[PDB]
Structures are given as C-alpha cells and as structure tokens.
RNA sequence: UUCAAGAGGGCGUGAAACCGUUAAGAGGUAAACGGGUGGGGUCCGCGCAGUCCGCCCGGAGGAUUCAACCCGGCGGCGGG
RNA sequence: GGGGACCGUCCCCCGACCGGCGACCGGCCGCCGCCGGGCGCAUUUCCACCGCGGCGGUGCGCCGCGACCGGCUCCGGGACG
RNA sequence: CGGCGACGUCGGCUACCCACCCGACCCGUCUUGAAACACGGACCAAGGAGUCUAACACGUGCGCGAGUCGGGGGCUCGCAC
RNA sequence: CCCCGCGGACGCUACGCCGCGACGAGUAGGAGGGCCGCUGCGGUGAGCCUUGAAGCCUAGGGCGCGGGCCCGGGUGGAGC
C-alpha cells in the first residue's frame, strides 16, 4: 500500500489516501492558546421567562 | 371601516394600554416590557429610554 | 433498497399518489413518442426544435476511421513531452529546440487555442491550423508535417 | 434471474476501505468495540515471528 | 484521537444498548455506564474505573497509564482499597483531584464507589 | 384565527452536512464553535460551505487560484477554498502559494510543494488564524457544469441559446423543423 | 418497603382511554388498532362532533413524566445479571424488569442481585 | 399405557366466525358509538400504623484503630 | 540493441546545527497521590445500636382542612378632583 | 394541622357489566353535491395490487480528478466460505 | 503567595443539552421522522431457552399522541 513518501511497489499506481484533517484532537485544538485568544467570553447565564406582573 | 372600530385615545388609555398589554418587538420576538432596559436598548438612540418616554 | 421508497409510505392511501379523479390508467396520450405532431406538438416544439424533417446529404457506408483526426490545442502541447524535456530546453544555452511529435501522443491536428511559453519548439503533426502555425512561429519554433 | 445481483466498486474505493479497515484494527478502542476480548494482548498491532 | 474514535463508536459498538428509549454503554471503565463521550472508558488516554473487589469486600480503582496506549496488557493499573467507606472515598478523591487525573470524573467515581460499598454491606430483611 | 400564510415558515437551508464523513464532521464541530464564539464572519462563511453539497463546492483549478492570488495586495495571504484544489496543466509556472483546502489533487499538491508553497487542512487553518485574518476566501466556478447549459428558457423559444437533450449530435438529430427557415420556421 | 424514586412528580395524562379505530365496534375483522380514516365522506376524519376522536400531537405527555410508571420509575428490560449492572448508577430513576423468556432458575439470580444493588424490579415474584 | 390422551389411527399446536352450557349484569324507542360521571364486579398494591439517608448532638457498647513517621511497590506531573 | 553519463525521486547510513520530548519511549532526579508492611494501641479513627433529638434533601398509606404570597379574572364598598 | 386504618375496609383502572345527561345517519367509491330511494359490502380466516430490467433527466453521498472507468480478457493451490 | 477545613451538586449520546418568541384546518398531492411492524443475510449481544422457545388465550399490570410494545397467568413442547 505504500507510504505517503513513496507509492506502492506492488500496485503500480496506488498511493495512500490523504487526510482532510491532520489533527483530529478536537479538545487540544479548542484549548490551544491561539484559539482561546480569539474567543469572546462565554454567555453562561440562563435568562428564563419573566412573569409579566 | 366595516372591519375596525377606531377613535381618539386619551392619556389614560395610552397609559393603561402600554402598562398592562405593552410588548416590544425585540429581535422579532414579542417580549413583555418588564424593564426599562428593554426599551432603552432598542429605542435609546431616539432618546426614548423608559415607559414614560414611550408613552409620551 | 425497497424500504427507502414512496411505496412504503403510500400504504393506506387509496390512490397510491396518482389521484382520485384522473386515476392511473394504462396509456393516456399514446405509447412512446406517440402524437409528437398532433397532441404532444407543444412539448416537441418547445424542447426539441428540429426534430421533424430531413436536412443535408445522406452518405452510404460511413467509415468513421477515414475521418479520424483528434486535435490538441497549443495550451496542452507541452504536456505531451516530459517536464525534463521542457526544463532542459529552457536552460539550454544553444538554440536547440525539442521535437514534439503529436502523432506519437495520439493527435493528428494541432489547433491554436491558448498561448505558448516563449521558447522554440519543433512540432510534428499531420495538420496545423493557421493560428497554431502563427503562434508556433511567434515563439521561434517550426511546424513540420508528417504523413 | 436478471435482477442485477452484482455491484462494481471502484478499485480506488476498495483500496480505500482496506486502508481504513487496517488503520482501525490498530486502535484498541475500535477492536474492543467489535468485542474481541483483547485485554491481555501484549500489543495490538500484534506481530509474531515467521515460525508460525 | 478520542474524538475520532468517538465518531466511530458513538452508534456502532458491541457495548451499546439501545432499549426502552434509553442508551447504556457496558465497556469496563465506564462510570455511570452511559453512552457518552465523557464517560466512554476506551477512547481516552486516561480513564478511571471503579469495580467491586473480586473477594466481595472493597473496591478496585483502575486507572490508565500514559505510555502504552496501544499495549492493552499493561495499560491499566489496578489497586484495591478495602478500608472503611469514608477513607475509601477519600483515597479516590485524592487519586483524581490531587493527580489532576481526569478531574471531571471525580464525583462519578465517588458516587460509584459509594454504590459498590453499599451493595457489599448485608441486605435488609 | 390569525391572517398569515405558513408556506414560507420553514427556511430551506443546510443546517449540517448531509455527508457522514467523520473527518468532515469533526472540523464542522471545530468551525461551529469558531463561528459561535468569535465575531468573525469568515468563520460563518466557512461553516456554511462545509455543510454544502459537492455541486455547491466546485473544484478550484490551480490557474484560477494563481490568478486570484496575483491581484494586488494579496501577497502573503492564505488562499482558502472549501473544496478540492485541482491541477491545471495549462499553466507552466507555479508561484509560492499558501493554501488551505478540503482536498488537493496529488499532482496539484506536488506542484505547489515544489514551488516552495504550503498546504494546510482546515484544522491547521483554525490554529494559524482562528478569525480568518489575512485570507483570500476563493470559490470554484459554481456554474461551470454541463447541467447549466441545458438550464434557462426552453430551446424551442426565440432568443434562447440553451442546449437541448439529444442522445447523439449530428445532422440528423434535431436540426430541421424549428431550426432553419427552410424547414417551417427558425425562431 | 419498596425502593422509592428520586422524585415523584404528579403525572398528568391528557387522555386515559385508548384511541379505537373507527367502526372497530361494528366488525370483528377490524381491530381496534388505530388507522387514520381516509374516506372521502368519512365523518370521523372530517371531525364531526360526537364522533370517534383522532390522535394528534396535542395529546402528547409532559416530557418530564413521559414513559414514567405509576411508581415514578422508568422500566428497562433486562435479560441477565450483566444487563442489570447498567442500572447501578440509575437506581433512583430506572427500574429493571426481567424478560418473559428468562427461566425461573436464572431470574432468581437477577432478583437477588437487584436487591443487593438497590435496583427496583417491577416483576420480582414472577416465576415461583 | 404414557411426561402428556385437556397426544385416542385425518390423532403436533388448535385462532376467528358460529354454537351449547354455566356465572354476572341488563332489557318497551333495533343495536352499536363519542364525552362525562356514578353503581356493581374481577383483579392488583407484601396497603392496613407507612419512606429513606447525609451531617451533627447526647446515651451505652465493640474493634484487622487514626494522624504523623520508616521501608517497599506503583502511578501522575515537571526538568536547561 | 548493450554499456555509460545526467536528471527526478526514493531506501539505508556515516555527523553536526535548528524546533520539541510532544498525544513515539526509557533512566535519573523533584513534587504529589495511592497501595502493602511496620510503628503509632487511645480526648484519635472506624463499626453497629438507642433517642417518639436537631439541621438538610426527598416524600407522606389513604382521606381531608387551614394560612399567607403571587398571577389572572369577575364583583362590591369608600373617598377625591 | 386533623381523621382513619386487616379478615373489613383503603387506593386504582386504562380494562368487565350496568344506569343516566349531552352528542351522535353506514362505511368504501365516483361525484359540484351521499345517510341516500346511487353502486360494492351476510360473517370470519388466510392470500391479494407501483415490481424488476433497460434508457434518460435532475438532486444527493463517495473516490479520483483533466482525467476517469477494466465492466470484456488474463494471472493468481480451481473450487468450505 | 487562599489554606485551622485539602474541599465543593448536575452536566456536554455536540446526531447532545439548554433558552426565548410566534404559530397549529385540510381532500388530491408532496416531503420528513418513526426506539412503528413482517421476513431473510452480514456483524454483534461470553444474548434467551426443556428449571420451558415459537404460537395461541386472558374481567391481569402498564407504557406510548399513535403505529405498537413490555410484563403477570394459562396452554404449548423446540426453537427465538
Ligand atoms: Mg392525503
Ligand atoms: Mg381501502
Ligand atoms: Mg376528468
Ligand atoms: Mg389534426
Ligand atoms: Mg396550513
Ligand atoms: Mg394511553
Ligand atoms: Mg373489531
Ligand atoms: Mg366531499
Ligand atoms: Mg400436553
Ligand atoms: Mg390436535
Ligand atoms: Mg360462551
Ligand atoms: Mg363508485
Ligand atoms: Mg350526478
Ligand atoms: Mg359515502
Ligand atoms: Mg334519496
Ligand atoms: Mg338501483
Ligand atoms: Mg357504477
Ligand atoms: Mg349487494
Ligand atoms: Mg365478497
Ligand atoms: Mg392477511
Ligand atoms: Mg391556531
Ligand atoms: Mg395540519
């Protein structure tokens, strides 16, 4: 099946398929300081329905 | 005209309509006018920041 | 998969999606391209103009091999040789130009769409167009005919 | 009998599926999620000598 | 990756039980035994499991070591805590909080340990 | 009763990819967070294109990408395409390009890398520019498809130049009546 | 005595009777299983007054008490002791119950283990 | 006899329509049906002195007895 | 036709500089945690029992009553301009 | 905050029977219009009707991508699969 | 530089969870969802079963808006 550096030597045209996402560690990506620097602060307060008095 | 009844409201009618049944169209939603902050946030650029300003 | 189709969702609906008034009958309108000039004329005229009638000269015993002449444009001329052929000629000090035999690559006629890189090349072909020859001579190349 | 029982799949897609299957068979979470009782297996790309 | 492996087993797993509008996951190191990304005990580089002791007294706290992820024979370190209920919960709390080892599972492991120890004391007639 | 109409209540748009590709779904998870938690409209455009179908994500040739990146003031910018980057064999010289694509053809990738260029996936682009700063968001030709030649006014109407559906092309196939004044009419 | 649920809210059922099929009273060949009427003149489909009512989404149960037994629990069908263990951390909200095909010898062990784990069984004295 | 004839030579199981008998209820607007109650009945509820468990206080008891130290094992994190 | 040279990729090496020890791993240390064994043998720690004990949560086997608060609503008195 | 609690009572009922008040014409179908003095339907069981092939068109998913596709053939212990 | 307390609920199947607002007739017809249902195949449940499978019966207990489903009792006797 070959490497990504070299094609397969027993299939004459085949090479390993490529990744459309190199780093699948989603938690590492989201927690990275460059991602965290660009984010606005979370809006974690729940605003429930106000009973109109 | 066959479909409506209309007339000239007085001051008391305007007060009681806004105070009891007054709802604002805030972000296309029907939100009860429970706080002045709801009015001031959408109409404050016109100088209207309270229920009194809206009634006036 | 028959489980993904409308027939599974039409169980319990009496008409099976074909209506109560007009129903699903055998062949209302005819079979195949029936009535293409009488009661399907609007459809045939609207979507298939030119459908009826003869045009041109008929030719018995057409042999498609006689008129076999695949064509290649100038913008793809340098793909018929290796990139090494190209880069060696570009950095060549002398005036030596590589030969591209399009007949070897499977084309007979060289058309002139696109532009050529500015370096001479000898092009062998059965046929050339006027503008293809003009552009080849513009980059300093030559057109040579083969049979 | 002429129901088109057979399907043809592109060679590149069949090669793709082999690569995905081999890659997944190197992860303990995926193999255990098949239910293969690999708990005392010393190493999951498990390779033995040629004497076998 | 944990997220990549989750996208493979989130709906296709031998531990997956979908029944009675409920979903459970029965792999060994799943506290709360639920099919969730956080509680899955196979896809993470560090997992916590609490099981009853083999002899029927105490708990076994199993944690996943960091190095040999692809070597399942040595990947899990098991210890047996067979002391009183309060000190057993303290040991599990210190294992998770002090080590910074997967602190989102601290109360899940404590509650599971309490359930195990309560099931080991004699039943009531 | 309320005097309203309900035939346009449900907006028809992709809220998620119809694909089951788990790698596409993971970086949809990434850019769904980026669009929500930043004020960048670049993330919103990228996220909605990740949902899009393949016909709505046409391939982008190397020549078109080179041409759009050669416009003034676009140097040292990352060309981002939500789709495939395709080699064009009609271009002879490839400049130094920094590109982020969903897919890159093997030969296009080799040409870009030989030129000294850089290829990023969409998760690497998120790390390199979470707000999408310094990017040229490009698209392939949306209407560069054979179906669009048949779309439009019907072929049998005046001033319409839309291709008809014919099984074969030749002098015997839809060329006589309604196509020339010598056979009935032309329009 | 019996194991109590975590919370026991009042369960409100919008309808208690069953939706019987139209004209299932008049015939034996028509089972009471609900079928949507689709006749052109069908007065049940047209919703005339005093007729058989049709199920619609407005009868849906409160999502807080949906699928909840009168005891306040929610059942989970188990087949052996291993499937009983998954309710260890759902003691106060879910109750196990043993499948009909489980033998009497094996459902003894399920009941004994459930008593150890404080899991409520809806049919504990079922084959004895 | 058989495990079983509530398997008895067209005999595995044995539905519905329909019929006999027994039990309960009812009956002059043909029956049947939807909604709402009421009465009776058959069952169900380990119903019949009514949950449970966390901390604290007091009482009287037991104990591989606790913290801190030492030895060993194993982990987690960090190290130009 | 062979044999060469050249170019492009590769696969191993002989070495150094650069970014990292990482989600590729070991040894040393440093901190921390757990376990086992000693020691600690009693104002500590734990175990179970009792009080119609208190503070929390949940909930009363069944049938019921009351109170105040708030929302909506229909009414009734009294007074002012 | 009150009362009540085992061989009589407590709670339950979707479900069994009965009574009463209000509402309620027999379904299917064609039809502008069916309860129709329009047709089919005595009852029950089992069976019973948009399928497959080919060819187009558009949409959608997948792989590769100026290419793509071995489908016919051949090579691989000829053969449990 | 938190430390007499070394401690502090739940959560987030992200195809998940949460909030707010408006809305809800429907033949022919279209679309979506179905942890609705039947049969068979590949996987999986260290699944169930002669201490009793399928099927059938049932004034038995329930769940779901519904399609339907689960459980108790009886019969049955080998598969689901
Ligand atoms: Mg319809
Ligand atoms: Mg019908
Ligand atoms: Mg007609
Ligand atoms: Mg005519
Ligand atoms: Mg409508
Ligand atoms: Mg119901
Ligand atoms: Mg019936
Ligand atoms: Mg009508
Ligand atoms: Mg028998
Ligand atoms: Mg018989
Ligand atoms: Mg009888
Ligand atoms: Mg008719
Ligand atoms: Mg008529
Ligand atoms: Mg009718
Ligand atoms: Mg009449
Ligand atoms: Mg007649
Ligand atoms: Mg007729
Ligand atoms: Mg008749
Ligand atoms: Mg008949
Ligand atoms: Mg049938
Ligand atoms: Mg409405
Ligand atoms: Mg509707």
From Swiss-Prot, chain A:
Report the locations given in the UniProt record: Cytoplasm
Report the residues modified as Phosphothreonine: 3
According to its UniProt record, how is this protein modified after translation? Answer: Citrullinated by PADI4.
Which residues carry the post-translational modification Phosphoserine, per the record?
A: 27, 32
Q: Which residues carry this modification: Citrulline?
A: 37
| Domain of life of the native organism | Eukaryota
- What's this protein's family per the entry? Belongs to the universal ribosomal protein uL4 family.
Q: How does it assemble?
A: Component of the large ribosomal subunit. May bind IPO9 with low affinity. Interacts with RBM3.
Q: So what does this one do?
A: Component of the large ribosomal subunit. The ribosome is a large ribonucleoprotein complex responsible for the synthesis of proteins in the cell.
Name used for this protein in its record: Large ribosomal subunit protein uL4
Q: What is the lineage of its organism?
A: Eukaryota, Metazoa, Chordata, Craniata, Vertebrata
From Swiss-Prot, chain B:
What assembly does the database describe for this protein? Component of the large ribosomal subunit. Homodimer. Interacts with DHX33.
Protein name per Swiss-Prot or TrEMBL: Large ribosomal subunit protein uL30
What does the UniProt entry say about where the protein is found?
Cytoplasm
- According to the UniProt record, list the residues that bear Phosphotyrosine: 3
Annotated function: Component of the large ribosomal subunit. The ribosome is a large ribonucleoprotein complex responsible for the synthesis of proteins in the cell. Binds to G-rich structures in 28S rRNA and in mRNAs. Plays a regulatory role in the translation apparatus; inhibits cell-free translation of mRNAs.
Highest taxon of the source?
A: Eukaryota
Origin organism is: Homo sapiens (Human)
The entry's family comment says: Belongs to the universal ribosomal protein uL30 family.
Swiss-Prot record, chain C:
Modifications made to the protein after synthesis: Hydroxylated on His-38 by MINA.
Q: Which residues carry this modification: (3S)-3-hydroxyhistidine?
A: 38
Q: Where is the composition biased (Basic residues)?
A: 1-29
Its keywords, alphabetically, are: Acetylation, Cytoplasm, Hydroxylation, Phosphoprotein, Ribonucleoprotein, Ribosomal protein
Instruction: Return any one Pfam family short name.
Output: Ribosomal_L27A
The places in or outside the cell where this protein is found are: Cytoplasm
State if Acetylation is listed as a keyword. yes
Which Gene Ontology molecular-function terms are recorded?
RNA binding; structural constituent of ribosome
Carries keyword Ribosomal protein?
A: yes
Q: Which PROSITE patterns match?
A: RIBOSOMAL_L15 (PS00475)
Query: What SUPFAM superfamilies is this protein classified in?
Result: Ribosomal proteins L15p and L18e
Domain of life per record = Eukaryota
Q: Which GO terms describe its biological process?
A: cytoplasmic translation; translation
Gene Ontology terms: cellular component = cytoplasm; cytosol; cytosolic large ribosomal subunit; cytosolic ribosome; endoplasmic reticulum; membrane; nucleoplasm; synapse
What positions are modified (N6-acetyllysine)? 46, 54, 109
Q: Principal place where this protein is found?
A: cytoplasm
Q: Where is this region: Disordered?
A: 1-37
User: Entry's InterPro entries?
Assistant: Rbsml_uL15_N (IPR027386), Ribosomal_uL15 (IPR030878), Ribosomal_uL15/eL18 (IPR021131), Ribosomal_uL15/eL18_sf (IPR036227), Ribosomal_uL15_CS (IPR001196)
Transmembrane parts of this sequence? none
Q: At what positions is Phosphoserine found?
A: 67
Function comment: Component of the large ribosomal subunit. The ribosome is a large ribonucleoprotein complex responsible for the synthesis of proteins in the cell.
What family is it from?
A: Belongs to the universal ribosomal protein uL15 family.
Q: How does it assemble?
A: Component of the large ribosomal subunit.
State what protein this is by name.
Large ribosomal subunit protein uL15
Swiss-Prot record, chain F:
Q: Which keywords appear in this protein's UniProt record, sorted alphabetically? A: Cytoplasm, Diamond-Blackfan anemia, Disease variant, Endoplasmic reticulum, Isopeptide bond, Phosphoprotein, Ribonucleoprotein, Ribosomal protein, Ubl conjugation
**Where do Basic residues bias regions lie?**
160-170, 177-187
| CC per GO annotation | cytoplasm; cytosol; cytosolic large ribosomal subunit; cytosolic ribosome; endoplasmic reticulum; focal adhesion; membrane; nucleolus
Q: Which domain of life is it from?
A: Eukaryota
What does this gene product do? Answer: Component of the large ribosomal subunit. The ribosome is a large ribonucleoprotein complex responsible for the synthesis of proteins in the cell.
Subunit architecture = Component of the large ribosomal subunit.
| Compartments reported by the entry | Cytoplasm, Cytosol; Cytoplasm; Rough endoplasmic reticulum
> Molecular function terms in GO for this entry?
RNA binding; structural constituent of ribosome
**Where does this protein chiefly localize?**
cytoplasm
Q: Which organism is it from?
A: Homo sapiens
**Pfam families assigned to the protein according to its UniProt record, in alphabetical order:** Ribosomal_L18 (PF17135)
Q: What is the lineage of its organism?
A: Eukaryota, Metazoa, Chordata, Craniata, Vertebrata
InterPro entries linked: Ribosomal_eL18, Ribosomal_eL18/eL18-A/B/_CS, Ribosomal_uL15/eL18, Ribosomal_uL15/eL18_sf
Locate the region Disordered.
150-187
Q: Which residues carry this modification: Phosphothreonine?
A: 157
What is the name of this protein? Large ribosomal subunit protein eL18
